[PDB]
From a paper:
In Pectobacterium, iron acquisition via plant ferredoxin is mediated by the Ferredoxin uptake system (Fus), a molecular machine consisting of inner and outer membrane transporters and a periplasmically localised protease. Intriguingly, the outer membrane transporter from this system, a TonB-dependent transporter (TBDT) designated FusA, imports intact ferredoxin into the periplasm of the bacteria where it is processed by the M16 family protease FusC. To confirm the common architecture of these systems, we characterised the gene cluster analogous to the Fus from Escherichia coli: the ydd/pqqL operon. Furthermore, through structural and biochemical characterisation of the distantly related Fus homologues, YddB and PqqL from E. coli, we show that these proteins share key features with FusA and FusC, suggesting a conserved function.
In order to determine if FusA homologues possess the structural features required for protein import, we purified and characterised YddB, the FusA homologue from E. coli. YddB belongs to the outer membrane localised TBDT family and has been detected in the outer membrane and in outer membrane vesicles of E. coli in a number of studies. The structure of YddB was solved to a resolution of 2.4 Å by X-ray crystallography by molecular replacement. Based on identification of structural homologues using the Dali server, YddB is most similar to FusA with a RMSD of 2.2 Å and a Z-score of 42.2. As with FusA, YddB possesses a 22-stranded β-barrel fold, the pore of which is occluded by a globular N-terminal plug-domain. This fold is characteristic of the integral outer membrane TBDT family and like these proteins YddB possesses a hydrophobic transmembrane region. Comparison of the structure of YddB and FusA by dissection of their extracellular loops confirmed that the two proteins are structurally analogous; the eleven loops of these proteins share a common structure that is distinct from those of two other TBDTs, FhuE and Fiu. Substrate capture by TBDTs is mediated with an external binding site composed of these extracellular loops. The capture of the large ferredoxin substrate by FusA was shown to be mediated by a large open extracellular binding site. Analysis of the YddB structure revealed that it possesses an analogous binding site, with dimensions (27.8 × 29.2 Å) capable of accommodating a bulky protein substrate of similar dimensions to ferredoxin.
Author numbering: 29 to 175, 180 to 790
The structure:
């Protein structure tokens, strides 16, 4: 509806607030593990946490965190075919640790292998009324409709990866861990894909995508008090993906779709120091969706009936975790800790009922109107469970148990009703396009009536589509964190002597939101250059943070959640591309320059999210100065300037495609909290928290993918590809400890993949 200059460049970029990633572009770009986060790292609206996936943990194949326009990584709406696929149970808890209540999770409900998706669409700004419950952006994964059998093999290993490690981390890295932080010294990645589409009957068919991504990380199974490794074992990390879509083109009026979705993540861990501490930590999501499109003469009606199960779990091998003062395990003699703390889980089931009505285009004088309305109902069943009774204790040689704790078999469930109403009008007069809209959200979890005004306007300045300006104002209200209401039930299962149970105060919370002011320019320079300039301003208000206290008499820790967090972020992007690529001796060259600049100031850390507790600090000492906390730069997802030269080489006679991305990223600042002993500390300001920012290293990263399709074979069935990540083997310090011990980004990495079509 809005006029747009299509992206012919190597890397997709934001057009009118949205970026489209086709399967061609997902396959052409080197995407590592093939998680949606690998696809979106190149987007100028996105910032990753460079301290997350480092030289120390390339074995892990799970999806990574993404910040859109300064928003936190738990504030994005992840959807599959327009249906919510976001894990709102407790996305901030990523800890791989073992405990009675620890469960590792993230915001992505399904860890989807992107190589099976038809396309992925990211909305970063000018987001329409249909999308909601997010503070930063919307990621919409789309499933292919029948239109072919493809087999794909992809592999990599620790031998093909260069690890830049500080000498201080060498021992922990070789063992495979340091307490609850796990490393991947030795690993082998085998990824298998199977995709097919088959017409089953007249106007009826199905598409099925299956993917098994496995990483076998080798660590020490047992480490002694001395630090002596006794043996090594293989810890299976696997993500299974199963996607399927049935389409029945029943008639001119009706079209039916039935979608089956399933992602199975499973990771084996153990505590090196504790014998018999094996545990399976995982995440399982599956669901169904019946879509129906009814075409009438005056309007189009789209209905969706859906069910999704999103879960995370910890399943120890053992049910008892205990400390023997005189060890009876194997040949261990001293004090030893053995076992595990059973099986726990957390889940949310959504029952979705959506409707959208698209009225036919009509005129009121010379002003063209195309309105649309939506109504949605989502029932959420959210729960946490302790599957088996567990115990902990210290036992003496005689058999006397002390410091005994019992974890009781239990389950706690929550029922939530979510409603959505929305309407927008597509207004078009001459060279001006207008889309005014309003979205309404209500839930009985926080019981807040949320009104989101949504407005974007586009002006074709000369009406020849050479200069187009887009401006807009939009409000984005986020979703809920179900842990707040569920944790107390999980903490009540604990029966111990001096254990503080929890009381969580959250029902008076206002829903967190972003106000956005955005301006976009699409400009044709000369005959062959397309230039895109975008500015996005985001004010993040009523951001969730907390404060706590422990009460002795009642033996309770009272956490009171609040809306004290606030950030201001300025986002700028400048892109240059060619309408026509160069042609030299049959080699087609497609070049692109992308500038991305994101500066954010706030009184919180994005990684902390709703668990942030320092928002009550109105003032801080920052780099020797007593300043307002809101004026201080945000400490994470903080590499402000990004400059990229992207270049695709295509030589059809030889069946070769050469994709290259050269990315220069600005150094991030590592925040350090100063103690009274610190040389830079100021006693004058002792009543305030004091921080110093240490700038680290900038990174020049060259990622490449060389794809060969042997021309001798009829139908071009076979394709062999090589991916090289960080070709220059840049050594970049992503993070540093208080002592000065540095964490490094990953070094040169080689990926080999084969695909056969039939
Ligand atoms: C398509 C994938 C081709 C892989 C070719 C082998 C990659 C070699 O990889 C290199 O090997 C060196 C010696 O073993 C190591 O020192 C380097 O760290 C490693 O990057
Ligand atoms: C219909 C089945 C579709 C997927 C086919 C690929 C499954 C690969 O499966 C893998 O095979 C390996 C064989 O060496 C085993 O060692 C692994 O444990 C297994 O996960
Ligand atoms: C998961 C989908 C459930 C619906 C069952 C599939 C019905 C397919 O029905 C098909 O419809 C065609 C007309 O559209 C006819 O020409 C075919 O003979 C008939 O098999
Ligand atoms: C596609 C389905 C469209 C949305 C259906 C809206 C149903 C509204 O239902 C109403 O919700 C109120 C709020 O909890 C309740 O107080 C009322 O008792 C209930 O009937
Ligand atoms: C949170 C308490 C109700 C849980 C849902 C139970 C089964 C569906 O009952 C729902 O009740 C709502 C009223 O609250 C209505 O708005 C819905 O239309 C109705 O489907
Ligand atoms: C078509 C969509 C209809 C649903 C709109 C949401 C109406 C929310 O309405 C609210 O319902 C609560 C009960 O759950 C009451 O406590 C509130 O007083 C009432 O304002
Ligand atoms: C398509 C490009 C649009 C350019 C928009 C104007 C430049 C925005 O610039 C911003 O202005 C703010 C004003 O208070 C300052 O606070 C920011 O530091 C500054 O970066
Ligand atoms: Mg290596
Ligand atoms: Mg309330």
């Amino acid at each position: 509806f809005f006029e747009e200059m299509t992206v012919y460049a190597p890397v997709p970029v934001p057009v009118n607030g949205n970026t489209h990633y086709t399967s061609e572009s997902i396959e052409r770009l080197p995407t590592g593990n093939g998680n949606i986060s690998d696809l979106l790292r190149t987007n100028p609206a996105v910032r990753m946490d460079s301290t997350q996936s480092t030289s120390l943990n390339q074995g892990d194949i799970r999806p990574e965190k993404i910040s859109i326009h300064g928003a936190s990584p738990y504030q994005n709406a992840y959807l599959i075919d327009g249906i919510s696929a976001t894990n709102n149970l407790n996305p901030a808890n990523e800890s791989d640790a073992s405990s009675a209540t620890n469960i590792s999770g993230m915001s992505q409900g399904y860890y989807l292998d992107v190589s099976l998706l038809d396309n992925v669409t990211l909305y970063d700004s000018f987001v329409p009324v249909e999308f909601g419950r997010f503070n930063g952006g919307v990621i919409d994964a789309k499933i292919k409709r029948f239109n072919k059998v493809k087999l794909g093999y992809r592999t990599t290993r620790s031998d093909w990866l260069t690890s830049h490690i500080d000498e201080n981390n060498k021992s922990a890295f070789n063992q495979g861990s340091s307490g609850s932080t796990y490393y991947s010294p030795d690993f082998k990645k085998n990824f298998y894909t199977l995709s097919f589409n088959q017409e089953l009957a007249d106007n009826f068919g199905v598409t099925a995508g299956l993917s098994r991504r496995q990483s076998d990380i080798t660590r020490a199974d047992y480490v002694s008090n001395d630090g002596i490794v006794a043996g090594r074992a293989q810890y299976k990390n696997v993500i299974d993906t199963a996607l399927s879509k049935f389409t029945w083109f029943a008639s001119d009026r009706f079209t039916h779709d039935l979608t089956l979705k399933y992602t199975g993540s499973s990771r084996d861990y153990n505590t090196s120091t504790f014998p018999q501490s094996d545990r399976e930590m995982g995440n399982k999501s599956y669901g169904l969706a019946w879509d129906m499109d009814t075409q009438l003469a005056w309007a189009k009606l789209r209905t969706t009936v859906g069910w999704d199960h999103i879960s995370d779990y910890t399943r120890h091998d053992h049910d008892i975790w205990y400390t023997e003062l005189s060890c009876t395990y194997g040949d261990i003699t001293g004090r030893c800790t053995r076992g595990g703390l059973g099986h726990i889980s957390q889940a949310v089931d959504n029952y979705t009922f959506k409707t959208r009505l698209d009225w036919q285009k009509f005129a009121v004088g010379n002003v063209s109107h195309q309105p649309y309305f939506g109504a949605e109902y989502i029932y959420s069943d959210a729960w946490t469970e302790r599957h088996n009774q567990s115990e902990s204790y210290v036992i003496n040689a005689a058999g006397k148990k002390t410091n005994h704790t019992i974890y009781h078999k239990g389950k706690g469930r929550l029922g939530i009703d979510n409603y959505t109403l929305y309407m927008a009008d597509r207004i078009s007069w001459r060279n001006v396009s207008l889309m005014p809209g309003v979205r309404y959200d209500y839930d009985n979890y926080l019981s807040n009536h949320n009104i989101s005004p949504r407005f974007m306007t586009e002006w074709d300045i000369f009406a020849n589509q050479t200069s187009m300006i887009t401006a807009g104002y939009n409000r984005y209200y986020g979703g809920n964190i179900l842990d707040m209401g569920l944790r107390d039930i999980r903490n009540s299962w604990t029966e111990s002597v001096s254990g503080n149970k929890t009381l969580t105060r959250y029902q008076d919370l206002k829903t967190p939101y972003n106000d956005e002011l955005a301006m976009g320019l699409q400009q044709k320079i000369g005959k062959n250059v397309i230039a895109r300039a975008n500015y996005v301003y985001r004010e993040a208000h009523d951001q969730i943070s907390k404060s706590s206290r422990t009460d002795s008499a009642t033996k309770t820790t009272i956490t009171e959640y609040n809306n004290d967090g606030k950030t201001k972020t300025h986002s700028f992007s400048l892109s240059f591309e060619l309408a026509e690529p160069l042609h030299i001796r049959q080699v087609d060259i497609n070049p692109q320059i992308v500038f991305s600049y994101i500066k954010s100031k706030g009184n919180l850390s994005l990684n902390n999210g709703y668990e942030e507790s320092n928002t009550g600090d109105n003032q801080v000492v920052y780099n020797g100065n007593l300043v307002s906390y809101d004026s201080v730069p945000v400490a994470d997802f903080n590499n402000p300037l990004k400059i990229s030269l992207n270049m695709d080489f295509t030589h059809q006679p030889s069946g070769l495609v050469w994709a290259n991305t050269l990315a220069w990223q600005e150094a991030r600042k590592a925040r350090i909290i100063l103690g009274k002993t610190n040389a830079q500390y100021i006693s004058e300001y002792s009543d305030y928290k004091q921080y110093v920012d240490e700038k680290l290293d900038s990174s020049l990263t060259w990622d490449t993918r060389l794809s060969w399709t042997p021309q001798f074979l009829q139908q071009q069935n076979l394709t062999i590809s090589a991916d090289i990540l960080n070709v220059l083997d840049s050594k970049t310090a992503v993070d540093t400890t208080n002592t000065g011990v540095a964490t490094y980004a990953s070094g040169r990495t080689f990926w080999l993949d084969v695909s056969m079509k039939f």
